[PDB]
Amino acid sequence: ATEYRTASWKLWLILDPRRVLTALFVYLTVIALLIHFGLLSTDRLNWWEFQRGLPKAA
Amino acid sequence: ATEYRTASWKLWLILDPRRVLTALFVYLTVIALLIHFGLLSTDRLNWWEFQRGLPKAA
Amino acid sequence: ATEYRTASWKLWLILDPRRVLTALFVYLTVIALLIHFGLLSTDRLNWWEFQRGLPKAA
Amino acid sequence: CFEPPPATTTQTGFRGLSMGEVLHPATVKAKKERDAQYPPALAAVKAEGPPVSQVYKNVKVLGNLTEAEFLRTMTAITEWVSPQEGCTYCHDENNLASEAKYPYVVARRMLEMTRAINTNWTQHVAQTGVTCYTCHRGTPLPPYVRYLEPTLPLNNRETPTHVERVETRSGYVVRLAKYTAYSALNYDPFTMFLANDKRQVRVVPQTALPLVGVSRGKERRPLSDAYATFALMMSISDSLGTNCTFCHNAQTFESWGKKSTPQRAIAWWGIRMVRDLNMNYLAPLNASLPASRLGRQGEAPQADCRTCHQGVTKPLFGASRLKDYPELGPIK
Amino acid sequence: SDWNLWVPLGILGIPTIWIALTYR
Amino acid sequence: SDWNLWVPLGILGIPTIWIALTYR
Amino acid sequence: MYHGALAQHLDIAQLVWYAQWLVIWTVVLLYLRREDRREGYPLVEPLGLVKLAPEDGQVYELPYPKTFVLPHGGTVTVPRRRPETRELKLAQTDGFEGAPLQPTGNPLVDAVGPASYAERAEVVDATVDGKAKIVPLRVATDFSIAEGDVDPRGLPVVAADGVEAGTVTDLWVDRSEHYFRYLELSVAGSARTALIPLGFCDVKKDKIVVTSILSEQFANVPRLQSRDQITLREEDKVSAYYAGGLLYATPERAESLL
Amino acid sequence: CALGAFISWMLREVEISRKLGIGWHVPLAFCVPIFMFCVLQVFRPLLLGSWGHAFPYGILSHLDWVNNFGYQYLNWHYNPGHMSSVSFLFVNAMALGLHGGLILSVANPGDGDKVKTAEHENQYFRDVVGYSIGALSIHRLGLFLASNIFLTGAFGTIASGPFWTRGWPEWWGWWLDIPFWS
Amino acid sequence: ADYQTIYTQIQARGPHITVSGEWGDNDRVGKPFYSYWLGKIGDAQIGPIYLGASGIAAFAFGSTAILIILFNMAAEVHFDPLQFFRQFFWLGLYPPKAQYGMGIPPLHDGGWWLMAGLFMTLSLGSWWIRVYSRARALGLGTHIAWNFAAAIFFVLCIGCIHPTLVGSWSEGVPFGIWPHIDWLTAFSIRYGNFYYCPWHGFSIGFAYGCGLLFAAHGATILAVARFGGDREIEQITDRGTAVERAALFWRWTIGFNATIESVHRWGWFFSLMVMVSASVGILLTGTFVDNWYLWCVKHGAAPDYPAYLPATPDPASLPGAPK
Ligand code: BCB
Ligand code: BCB
Ligand code: BCB
Ligand SMILES: C/C=C1/c2cc3[nH]c4c(c3C)C(=O)[C@H](C(=O)OC)c4c3nc(cc4[nH]c(cc(n2)[C@@H]1C)c(C(C)=O)c4C)[C@@H](C)[C@@H]3CCC(=O)OC/C=C(\C)CCC[C@H](C)CCC[C@@H](C)CCCC(C)C
Ligand SMILES: C/C=C1/c2cc3[nH]c4c(c3C)C(=O)[C@H](C(=O)OC)c4c3nc(cc4[nH]c(cc(n2)[C@@H]1C)c(C(C)=O)c4C)[C@@H](C)[C@@H]3CCC(=O)OC/C=C(\C)CCC[C@H](C)CCC[C@@H](C)CCCC(C)C
Ligand SMILES: CC(C)=CCC/C(C)=C/CC/C(C)=C\CC/C(C)=C/CC/C(C)=C/CC/C(C)=C\CC/C(C)=C/CC/C(C)=C/CC/C(C)=C/CC1=C(C)C(=O)c2ccccc2C1=O
Ligand SMILES: COC1=C(OC)C(=O)C(C/C=C(/C)CC/C=C(/C)CC/C=C(\C)CC/C=C(\C)CC/C=C(/C)CC/C=C(\C)CC/C=C(\C)CC/C=C(\C)CCC=C(C)C)=C(C)C1=O
Ligand code: HEC
Ligand code: HEC
Ligand code: HEC
Ligand SMILES: CC(C)=CCC/C(C)=C/C=C/C(C)=C/C=C/C(C)=C/C=C\C=C(C)\C=C\C=C(/C)CC/C=C(\C)CCCC(C)C
Ligand SMILES: CCCCCCCCCCCC[N+](C)(C)[O-]
Ligand SMILES: [Fe+3]
């Protein structure tokens, strides 16, 4: 190893960058979607619309 | 490597540009559509239409 | 054993890191989602929304 | 989404036929909570003095009562219809006998209507009867009404989205579907069957063989009429929160006798009663309302099943005030 | 504010420690 | 503006640091 | 007055009903069922009383004969009279019509019960070109295993005992289906290759497990006539041997569970 | 007695197949409908807690049960378990037709034409629709289609009552109502 | 378990041999490719495809139809692309809603319906020809064509023939996912309950029959695949232990058997019969029977049950009823 401290790196000998990469891509995208849409489906916490909340108002 | 600082680039020896390119192309396109259409299905932030948002008015 | 105490480690001779790793990944994700959404489906312990709880009020 | 067990089940037809209602116990609880805000009867008063017709000056419906009774009624009315604006809502504060505010003159007519229901449609509403509350549920705009286009959402206390708004032309199909229990049937059954007495609901032939002279070409009805009936039924079901087998034995939708429950009779009267309401009390109000109330084709709002039942087979689970407010009917 | 109620702390914490110490 | 609502910073920040330091 | 009324109680629908029925049964009986008797009929009798005629209604039964003109010359006529002349090594439990039979010697070699084969024509199965259909991968050099699978060549064949019977020499391919039919293994202890149907072995990463028969009886799997091609009869012979072992490998395979 | 008969039937088959040294596929396949019977007559009634939820024995009578049951959810056609089952039912029928025909065409090619080969089966389909599933696998596939008629349906059946009490169309609301494009 | 019946463990690759037709060896189209996943259930190779005239034509009409259908579905949501995609199953192309008898209806009310109908009809036919011709091209028998025929005919019956015999286009099936289904209920309600029509019966019988038969045949072949029973054609011309067992199995169970050849006939026959039975029923309906239940009662087939809740006389028929 070129000046390392742990052996962490050896993970990639075991695991495969391409899998991890492609997976993370997906994983994060989905989560990101869930949150975004999720938020935009509330009343508080929707930008993109007039305040449906009727927050305390009536 | 022509005066490169990182090894970053070796990624393309691992990954395959053609896949990446094609995926982004699609990925992006979709997000883009979601945003466009999704926006244009609100009341505020719909250009293209008359403000039948009736913002608070009535 | 490079200054070890137990043989605990021999587990990975028997088990396979990759299986464990990949499963834990999923297992945890699911429990995480469970709790998050679970909470966010109550009345007390919903952040993201106005206090629908009507805590005692009405 | 996958609604968890158990289920309340009843039996409405002969054993082994799979007829009867199927309820989610949870949902019923929720509805029962909702139908409990019905304000309790007011404390009864001693009938003492002269008739109101001699006391006041502008009574034209409730002439009979005593001064004290009369005000009781007014108090009840207030609570059922306009609790928030109070008395003020349809009276000038000082000259009470002024017909100035618009709701006043609607309200006089509503009184006539309610009376009539509790007198002439006894065969739908029985000894249970209705009060303003039945429909209004404590607002001056009853939370389920109908216009001549399908609108959404069903409950007009919620706020519409962009696609739900009537003006959004793309959203029509959905506006329609939600009215008929999410099926894709393409007819608005309110305007076909309920608004007036102009169509026949019965579509099935009452004989085994095709009857010569009504059975071919332009003699025949269009298969539309079947779908349209199937639509009216879908909606009725959702309006009562029940299924076909609460009234028909599917074996033969068309048949009566041992193939229909007693409910089906009541429903038949039901239909004839809403029609009367719409054609005679409700629809000709577009003369009296403000334009703000009126629909796109300049019509007043009208009633259908949901307007009263609101998703229960008996409105307000059959809670009544019929003995407590005999001003509201029946009459002699 | 975590007062009188160390319940989750105990549940979370205890294992955290013996997981630390058992597998060295 | 986080007023003792360091909560998400806590959840976001902490691991961010040890992820920095553990795999070096 | 009604459409479709033949009397005050008789309508055209009602008549059609029966009609429909009629046809169904006719087809079933006067056709389909006849077509069914092209193989193995007329029925044979080894107890009953002076019978040249099955369930009665039926010695017409057999339809008149077809004549399949075969792809690579010759004709077959159906139904036929193909006589069984192998002399079965089976003793009867009772002399009774439908009482079962006991094998006299070794059932796996004497080829009886689940170990019996049909006397098929002693010719090689062919392609549309006129090549041999079933061949090994020494011959079909053009054919190959799909990239991503386990090549079973080299692996140990473990039998029912948990004992290595021998090692895999080759795969055999169907040339007109692109499908593998046989493993050819080298039976250890003798100087012989025996052919196992691929439907009798669970192929793993390390080993081929053969539940069918015991290690010792690999020595007696029927011998191939040629080295590089297989006849139709030899196929049946090979297959029947292992399947027979499903009832006859161990004595307990006979018995009921209790 | 019914259950009795069915099961005894199925086990008999197992005994038979043992005797012949053939696979047990047949008995097992026969197990699927048995299960559906059990689902309708036993489980679903258990879950709703009465026998009175089961269907009656009677040629026309049984259909009356089917009929009303289905209108208890307002339009059974929309129940997604049903959709799948129905699809299989149809595919299966069509597929049997094709398999039937294809063998028969090869065997009885008309005139004094020679019986054709396996390659002709393949060619034929790879022409008409451009794919051939191949000879063994069709058998395998047939068994699969057939079987999911009940396997998938069983889901829709059990669901109705214990896990869903509204009309089946209302259930597609999940999609129809995703608030994004609502 | 025996894994070799469920999926394929070791896949084979090699040169596929083309059977030369009578004509149109030239009109095979495309680079044949493989799918390793598909290779686990069947052949992996996916091209080429025959083209020729019938094809061309079938596509021609077929597409036109599709276009008219979709286009009108779009027009239902007023071309809002987002809504289209959300509402898609609920959209349809409907036949005429007024009574015009059999006159070619106005464009906006059923006109377009009719056109698509005609074109769908034409594609079906063109295709039929494809199926039939190809068979003859390769010296096979025509069985598939004839089965397919019956199917087509039944489509005709519910599409135009029945409408015709009663004489109104209003009775046509609509195009669209949900709405083609709503048709089913309407149609049944109108003709007094289809469970009670005998041909609906027959049909279903045969349909379930197919289920039974394929499961059985399917299972049977796999059970004897160890003896090479999947090689069904060679089994016909030179009977091996495989089908001997298969026969025996069935004989010892239900007490009569088939042949390897004839089982195929049975299956083919049952398949056909679904479609035929159906067609008949459809033709009889509206034309000779008006209400199938009542008809079953006239022939006393219909079961009758006692009342659970009190029996209810129809209110329309009371003294002093409204309308
Ligand atoms: C009211 C609050 C809001 C909010 C609150 C907010 C927070 C708190 C955060 C964001 C974040 C984000 N927001 Mg945002 N948001 C965004 C979009 C975004 C993204 C730019 C970013 C999401 C990063 C991510 O999730 O990674 C998903 C996928 C990733 C990272 C994949 C790439 C990594 C991959 C593993 C590496 C591989 C790359 C290879 C080259 C490709 C491989 C190809 C394969 C398939 C072969 C849009 C479009 C809008 C609109 C239109 O309104 C919006 C509105 C809002 N956001 C509201 C106003 N949002 C996050 C962020 O980090 O900002 C940048 C974030 O933390
Ligand atoms: C108005 C109500 C309807 C309805 C109500 C409905 C219900 C409630 C159910 C189905 C079910 C099914 N429906 Mg549907 N249906 C279907 C098709 C189907 C089947 C695919 C599927 C399963 C049938 C079944 O359960 O077998 C039953 C067969 C069994 C149980 C096996 C019995 C065999 C036994 C093991 C052996 C018997 C041996 C004999 C006793 C031996 C006697 C023989 C002699 C030789 C002695 C079609 C194609 C249509 C059309 C075209 O509209 C339709 C319309 C309707 N269905 C109407 C909309 N249907 C079932 C399903 O899967 O739902 C999702 C189901 O539960
Ligand atoms: C409430 C209404 C019901 C109903 C209404 C009903 C009607 C009205 C009819 C049937 C019919 C039938 N029903 Mg029934 N049904 C059936 C099953 C059946 C089928 C056996 C048979 C329909 C024939 C068929 O297979 O269609 C599927 C096969 C078809 C449609 C042929 C398609 C072939 C075509 C060439 C396809 C190729 C198309 C191309 C690819 C074109 C592409 C299009 C382009 C151009 C856009 C079951 C199993 C059940 C159960 C279990 O309850 C049931 C209950 C009901 N049915 C409910 C009671 N059913 C028919 C019948 O038999 O009546 C006597 C019929 O007319
Ligand atoms: C997806 C899977 C499909 C499938 C599969 C397979 N199907 C099989 C096999 C496989 C693999 C066999 O191996 C086995 C068989 O042997 O091959 C012929 C069999 C068989 N499938 C029969 C009928 C059949 N398959 C149906 C459905 C599917 N099959 C589905 C589609 C249906 C439908 C759908 O209604 C029917 C009616 C019998 C002919 C036969 C067993 C005889 C029996 O069971 O013996 C035992 C019982 C009797 C002979 C009589 C029983 C009398 C009882 C005691 C009491 C009276 C009955 C009472 C319950 C009243 C009900 C009547 C009422 C509704 C009005
Ligand atoms: C019991 C008897 C059963 C039975 C029997 C049989 N069934 C058969 C056969 C037999 C024997 C055949 O021989 C034939 C066939 O060959 O199969 C191999 C066939 C068939 N049954 C099909 C589908 C089916 N069977 C069903 C049912 C039953 N079958 C009943 C149950 C059902 C149900 C139940 O719904 C369905 C959906 C097709 C596969 C096939 C017709 C192809 C056609 O007729 O083509 C017509 C051509 C078209 C529609 C053109 C396509 C145009 C494309 C999509 C592009 C349009 C896009 C456009 C907007 C723009 C243009 C640009 C473009 C480039 C992008
Ligand atoms: C003589 C003497 C000593 C007397 C004294 C003895 C005495 C009286 C003793 C006591 C009697 C006792 C104890 C018992 C009685 C006997 C007994 C066990 C009886 C059980 C009988 C019984 C209930 C029979 C009913 C049969 C039954 C359930 C159904 C009938 C069959 C039906 C309706 C089938 C559906 C129709 C159908 C699918 C037909 C398909 C056609 C065929 C044949 C399909 C099968 C089949 C398939 C599917 C193939 O794939 C295949 C592939 C290659 C070759 C052949 C075949 C093949 O044959
Ligand atoms: C040999 O001669 C022959 C040929 O070769 C020459 C042929 O090619 C041919 C035929 C030529 C061909 C091209 C054949 C192709 C014809 C076809 C109809 C193939 C088409 C098949 C399909 C489209 C698949 C059907 C899919 C549908 C109908 C849509 C269903 C919709 C939904 C939502 C289904 C959802 C659920 C699923 C998809 C799967 C659910 C599965 C489960 C719940 C459990 C699964 C059960 C198992 C896996 C079995 C248990 C496991 C074990 C026992 C080990 C014949 C006839 C001939 O015999
Ligand atoms: C929703 C409408 C409505 C509300 C709310 C309402 N009223 Fe009335 N009120 C009427 C109508 C209509 C009449 C005339 C009734 C008639 O002619 O029989 C009336 C008549 C009266 C009269 C007789 C007028 C006269 O000639 O002197 C009095 C007094 C009266 N209301 C008092 C009240 C009081 C007090 C309240 C509230 C506490 C009240 N009302 C609330 C509709 C309403
Ligand atoms: C069966 C249904 C029904 C009953 C019962 C009923 N109402 Fe109404 N009411 C309506 C409908 C529908 C409208 C029309 C919606 C509207 O005009 O706002 C209406 C309108 C009104 C309005 C006009 C308010 C406005 O702002 O437009 C008043 C006031 C009113 N009702 C009072 C009464 C009173 C008082 C009673 C009882 C004596 C009563 N209603 C009973 C259905 C009913
Ligand atoms: C609340 C009672 C009730 C329910 C619930 C109900 N119906 Fe009806 N249905 C009726 C009445 C009443 C009629 C007859 C109305 C008339 O005479 O005008 C009727 C008529 C019909 C008809 C016409 C019969 C004919 O004579 O031509 C059909 C078909 C029908 N219903 C089907 C359904 C279906 C399907 C459902 C469930 C989706 C359903 N019904 C739910 C009360 C009901
Ligand atoms: C004499 C005169 C004037 C006219 C005679 C006309 C004539 C022959 C009329 C007869 C008409 C007939 C046979 C009509 C039949 C109609 C029937 C059976 C319709 C039935 C079902 C249709 C369904 C389920 C179709 C739904 C269709 C869709 C949702 C859209 C179509 C799209 C697809 C199937 C996907 C492919 C498109 C993709 C490549 C982008
Ligand atoms: C409702 C459709 C059912 C059609 C009937 C199916 C025929 C069953 C075959 C019986 C065979 C008779 N036998 C024993 C003489 O071969
Ligand atoms: Fe077959």
Coordinates of N, CA and C in Angstrom, one line a residue, chain H residues 9 12 16 20-23 25-26 60-61 63-64 66-67 77-78 83 92-93 97 99 101-105 108-109 116 120-121 123-124 126-133 137 139-140 142 175-176 181-182, chain I residues 4-6 19 28 38 42-43 45-50 83 85-86 127 130-131 134 138-139 141 143 147 178 182 193 195-196 210-211 214 217 219 223 226-227 232-233 245 249 252-253 264 268 271 301 305:
Chain H
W9 N -57.2 -39.3 -3.7 CA -56.9 -39.4 -5.1 C -55.4 -39.1 -5.4
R12 N -52.8 -41.7 -4.1 CA -52.9 -42.8 -5.0 C -52.0 -42.6 -6.1
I16 N -48.8 -44.6 -7.6 CA -48.7 -45.1 -9.0 C -47.3 -44.7 -9.6
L20 N -43.8 -46.7 -11.2 CA -43.4 -46.6 -12.6 C -42.0 -46.0 -12.8
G21 N -41.5 -45.5 -11.7 CA -40.2 -44.8 -11.7 C -40.2 -43.6 -12.5
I22 N -41.4 -42.9 -12.5 CA -41.5 -41.6 -13.2 C -41.5 -40.6 -12.2
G23 N -41.5 -39.3 -12.5 CA -41.5 -38.2 -11.6 C -42.9 -38.0 -10.9
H25 N -44.5 -35.2 -10.8 CA -45.1 -33.9 -11.2 C -46.6 -34.0 -11.3
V26 N -47.1 -35.1 -11.8 CA -48.6 -35.1 -11.9 C -49.3 -34.9 -10.6
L60 N -76.2 -25.1 -10.7 CA -76.4 -23.7 -10.9 C -76.2 -22.9 -9.5
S61 N -76.7 -23.6 -8.4 CA -76.5 -23.0 -7.1 C -75.1 -22.5 -6.9
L63 N -73.0 -21.2 -8.8 CA -72.7 -20.0 -9.5 C -73.3 -18.8 -8.9
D64 N -74.4 -19.0 -8.3 CA -75.1 -17.9 -7.6 C -74.2 -17.4 -6.5
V66 N -70.9 -17.6 -6.5 CA -69.8 -16.9 -7.2 C -70.3 -15.5 -7.6
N67 N -71.5 -15.4 -8.2 CA -72.1 -14.2 -8.6 C -72.2 -13.1 -7.5
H77 N -64.1 -7.5 -11.4 CA -63.2 -7.5 -12.5 C -61.9 -6.8 -12.3
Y78 N -62.0 -5.8 -11.4 CA -60.9 -4.9 -11.0 C -60.0 -5.4 -10.0
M83 N -57.3 -10.3 -12.2 CA -56.8 -9.9 -13.4 C -55.7 -10.9 -13.8
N92 N -53.2 -19.8 -21.4 CA -53.2 -21.2 -21.3 C -53.9 -21.8 -22.4
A93 N -55.2 -21.4 -22.6 CA -56.1 -21.9 -23.6 C -55.5 -21.8 -25.0
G97 N -54.0 -24.8 -27.7 CA -54.3 -24.7 -29.1 C -53.1 -24.8 -30.0
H99 N -49.9 -25.6 -29.2 CA -49.2 -26.8 -29.0 C -49.8 -28.0 -29.6
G101 N -52.1 -28.1 -32.2 CA -51.9 -27.9 -33.6 C -50.5 -28.2 -34.2
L102 N -49.5 -27.6 -33.5 CA -48.2 -27.8 -34.0 C -47.7 -29.2 -34.1
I103 N -48.0 -30.0 -33.1 CA -47.6 -31.4 -33.1 C -48.4 -32.1 -34.2
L104 N -49.7 -31.8 -34.3 CA -50.5 -32.5 -35.2 C -50.2 -32.2 -36.7
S105 N -49.7 -31.0 -36.9 CA -49.3 -30.5 -38.2 C -48.1 -31.2 -38.7
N108 N -49.1 -35.1 -39.3 CA -50.1 -35.4 -40.3 C -50.1 -34.3 -41.3
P109 N -49.0 -34.3 -42.2 CA -48.7 -33.1 -43.0 C -49.5 -33.0 -44.2
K116 N -42.7 -34.5 -40.7 CA -41.6 -33.5 -40.6 C -40.8 -33.7 -39.4
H120 N -38.6 -28.4 -38.3 CA -39.8 -27.8 -38.9 C -40.7 -27.1 -37.8
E121 N -40.8 -27.7 -36.6 CA -41.6 -27.1 -35.6 C -41.0 -25.7 -35.3
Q123 N -38.9 -23.9 -37.1 CA -38.9 -23.0 -38.2 C -40.3 -22.3 -38.2
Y124 N -41.3 -23.1 -38.2 CA -42.7 -22.6 -38.2 C -42.9 -21.4 -37.3
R126 N -40.7 -19.5 -35.5 CA -39.7 -18.5 -35.7 C -40.0 -17.7 -36.9
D127 N -40.9 -18.2 -37.8 CA -41.4 -17.5 -38.9 C -42.5 -16.6 -38.5
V128 N -43.6 -17.2 -38.0 CA -44.8 -16.5 -37.7 C -44.6 -15.4 -36.7
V129 N -44.0 -15.7 -35.5 CA -43.8 -14.7 -34.5 C -42.4 -14.5 -34.2
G130 N -41.5 -15.1 -34.9 CA -40.1 -14.9 -34.7 C -39.4 -15.4 -33.4
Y131 N -40.1 -16.2 -32.6 CA -39.4 -16.9 -31.6 C -39.9 -18.3 -31.4
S132 N -39.0 -19.2 -31.1 CA -39.5 -20.6 -30.7 C -39.0 -21.0 -29.3
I133 N -40.0 -21.2 -28.4 CA -39.6 -21.6 -27.1 C -38.9 -23.0 -27.0
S137 N -39.4 -27.2 -23.2 CA -39.8 -26.1 -22.4 C -41.3 -25.7 -22.6
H139 N -43.7 -27.7 -22.7 CA -44.3 -28.6 -21.7 C -44.2 -28.0 -20.3
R140 N -43.0 -27.6 -20.0 CA -42.7 -26.9 -18.8 C -43.5 -25.7 -18.6
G142 N -46.4 -24.8 -20.3 CA -47.8 -25.1 -20.1 C -48.1 -25.3 -18.6
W175 N -52.8 4.3 -7.4 CA -52.2 4.9 -8.5 C -52.9 6.1 -8.9
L176 N -54.2 6.0 -9.0 CA -55.0 7.1 -9.6 C -54.7 8.4 -8.8
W181 N -49.4 14.0 -9.5 CA -50.2 14.3 -10.8 C -51.7 14.3 -10.6
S182 N -52.1 14.1 -9.3 CA -53.4 14.5 -9.0 C -53.4 16.0 -8.7
Chain I
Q4 N -33.6 -30.4 -13.5 CA -33.5 -30.3 -15.0 C -34.9 -30.2 -15.7
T5 N -36.0 -30.2 -15.0 CA -37.3 -30.0 -15.5 C -37.8 -28.6 -15.2
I6 N -37.3 -28.0 -14.2 CA -37.7 -26.6 -13.8 C -37.0 -25.6 -14.6
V19 N -34.6 -24.4 -42.0 CA -35.4 -25.2 -42.9 C -35.9 -24.3 -44.0
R28 N -36.9 -13.4 -44.7 CA -36.5 -13.5 -43.3 C -35.6 -12.4 -42.9
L38 N -33.2 -15.9 -20.8 CA -34.2 -16.6 -21.6 C -33.8 -18.1 -21.9
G42 N -36.3 -22.4 -22.1 CA -36.4 -22.4 -23.5 C -35.2 -22.0 -24.3
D43 N -35.4 -21.9 -25.6 CA -34.3 -21.5 -26.5 C -33.9 -20.0 -26.2
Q45 N -32.2 -18.0 -28.5 CA -32.1 -17.3 -29.7 C -33.4 -16.7 -30.2
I46 N -33.3 -15.4 -30.6 CA -34.5 -14.6 -30.7 C -34.9 -14.1 -32.1
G47 N -33.9 -13.9 -33.0 CA -34.3 -13.6 -34.4 C -34.5 -14.9 -35.2
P48 N -34.5 -14.8 -36.6 CA -35.0 -13.7 -37.3 C -36.5 -13.6 -37.3
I49 N -37.1 -13.2 -38.4 CA -38.6 -13.3 -38.6 C -38.9 -13.2 -40.0
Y50 N -40.0 -13.9 -40.3 CA -40.5 -13.8 -41.7 C -41.3 -12.6 -41.9
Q83 N -51.8 13.8 -17.8 CA -53.1 13.2 -17.5 C -53.3 11.9 -18.3
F85 N -51.2 9.7 -19.4 CA -50.5 8.7 -18.8 C -51.1 8.2 -17.5
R86 N -51.6 9.2 -16.7 CA -52.2 8.8 -15.4 C -53.5 8.0 -15.7
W127 N -53.4 -11.6 -40.9 CA -52.6 -12.4 -40.0 C -53.0 -13.9 -40.2
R130 N -51.3 -15.3 -43.0 CA -49.9 -15.5 -42.6 C -49.8 -16.9 -42.1
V131 N -50.6 -17.2 -41.0 CA -50.5 -18.4 -40.3 C -50.7 -19.6 -41.2
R134 N -47.9 -20.0 -44.1 CA -46.6 -20.4 -43.6 C -46.6 -21.9 -43.4
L138 N -44.2 -24.8 -45.5 CA -43.2 -25.6 -44.9 C -43.7 -27.1 -44.9
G139 N -44.7 -27.4 -45.6 CA -45.3 -28.7 -45.8 C -45.9 -29.3 -44.6
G141 N -49.3 -29.4 -41.7 CA -50.7 -29.4 -41.7 C -51.3 -28.1 -41.3
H143 N -53.6 -27.2 -39.0 CA -54.3 -27.2 -37.7 C -54.3 -25.9 -37.0
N147 N -57.6 -23.6 -35.7 CA -57.9 -23.2 -34.4 C -58.1 -21.7 -34.4
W178 N -60.0 -0.7 -19.0 CA -61.2 -0.9 -18.2 C -62.5 -0.9 -19.0
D182 N -66.0 -3.1 -18.7 CA -67.3 -2.6 -18.2 C -68.4 -3.2 -19.2
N193 N -78.4 -12.2 -17.1 CA -77.4 -12.9 -16.3 C -76.8 -14.1 -17.1
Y195 N -74.6 -16.3 -16.3 CA -74.2 -17.6 -15.6 C -75.2 -18.6 -16.1
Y196 N -76.4 -18.1 -16.1 CA -77.5 -18.9 -16.7 C -77.7 -19.2 -18.2
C210 N -59.1 -27.0 -20.5 CA -57.8 -26.7 -21.1 C -56.8 -26.7 -20.0
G211 N -57.2 -26.0 -18.9 CA -56.3 -25.9 -17.7 C -55.9 -27.2 -17.2
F214 N -53.7 -29.1 -19.9 CA -52.3 -28.7 -20.1 C -51.5 -29.0 -18.8
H217 N -51.0 -32.8 -19.2 CA -50.0 -33.1 -20.2 C -48.7 -32.6 -19.9
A219 N -47.3 -31.8 -16.9 CA -46.8 -32.6 -15.9 C -46.3 -34.0 -16.3
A223 N -42.6 -35.6 -16.1 CA -42.4 -36.8 -15.3 C -41.7 -37.9 -16.1
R226 N -37.0 -37.9 -18.2 CA -35.8 -38.7 -17.9 C -35.6 -39.8 -18.9
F227 N -36.7 -40.2 -19.7 CA -36.6 -41.2 -20.7 C -36.6 -40.6 -22.1
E232 N -41.2 -35.6 -28.6 CA -42.6 -36.1 -28.8 C -42.8 -36.6 -30.2
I233 N -42.1 -36.2 -31.2 CA -42.4 -36.6 -32.5 C -41.9 -38.0 -32.8
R245 N -44.8 -45.7 -20.3 CA -45.1 -45.3 -18.9 C -46.2 -44.3 -18.8
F249 N -49.4 -44.9 -16.6 CA -49.8 -44.0 -15.5 C -51.2 -43.6 -15.6
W252 N -53.8 -46.6 -15.3 CA -54.0 -47.0 -13.9 C -54.7 -46.0 -13.0
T253 N -55.1 -44.9 -13.5 CA -55.6 -43.9 -12.7 C -57.0 -43.5 -13.0
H264 N -52.7 -34.8 -28.1 CA -52.6 -33.5 -28.7 C -53.9 -33.2 -29.4
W268 N -56.2 -29.9 -28.7 CA -56.5 -29.1 -29.8 C -58.1 -29.0 -29.9
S271 N -59.4 -26.7 -27.0 CA -59.1 -25.3 -27.3 C -60.2 -24.8 -28.3
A301 N -84.8 -25.2 -14.7 CA -83.4 -25.4 -14.3 C -82.9 -24.6 -13.1
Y305 N -84.6 -20.3 -3.7 CA -84.3 -20.2 -2.3 C -85.4 -19.6 -1.5

